[PDB]
């Protein structure tokens, strides 16, 4: 059975709730493992305390830059940006988790939670998971975004980890 991980989301320090995600380890094991391990913190670094630095309504919430917190950072557990594993899965609707990148084969630790069907990403971003519970929280987050992705409040991952 695919692994499930969670983020506890806070806004300006106040709890919003828990979002959980299924990671598609059966289709993209390398990409799923990277996100999984960054969520547990088992390698000694990861997503806990990091923020969503760009939110674009009708498109996505972007996070994962736990090193510079502004989209210029992030790193994978593999010690280098890593290759696009495959494009088996498509961007079929809201709740899809897909990798952010700076072009082919530049995956690090940044990701999008898609808040719509984002078919314009197909074949360029690796889909590796989906929201399981907590979609209404993602909808609430989207409301703090604006043009170009500027957020009006600090949205953070207060805690994160792996469920049974």
Swiss-Prot record:
Its main location: cytoplasm. Changing residue 120 to H: No effect on peptidyl-prolyl cis-trans isomerase activity. It catalyses: [protein]-peptidylproline (omega=180) = [protein]-peptidylproline (omega=0). The modification N6-acetyllysine is found at residues 27, 43, 75, 81, 124, 130, 132. Changing residue 120 to F: 75-fold decrease of sensitivity to CsA. There is a cross-link at residue 27 (Glycyl lysine isopeptide (Lys-Gly) (interchain with G-Cter in ubiquitin)). The modification Phosphothreonine is found at residue 92. It is found in: Cytoplasm; Secreted; Nucleus. Residues 6-162 form the PPIase cyclophilin-type domain. It holds the Pfam family Pro_isomerase. GO terms for cellular component: cytoplasm; cytosol; extracellular exosome; extracellular region; extracellular space; ficolin-1-rich granule lumen; focal adhesion; membrane. Its EC number is 5.2.1.8. The modification N-acetylvaline is found at residue 1. Glycans are attached at residue 107. This is Peptidyl-prolyl cis-trans isomerase A.
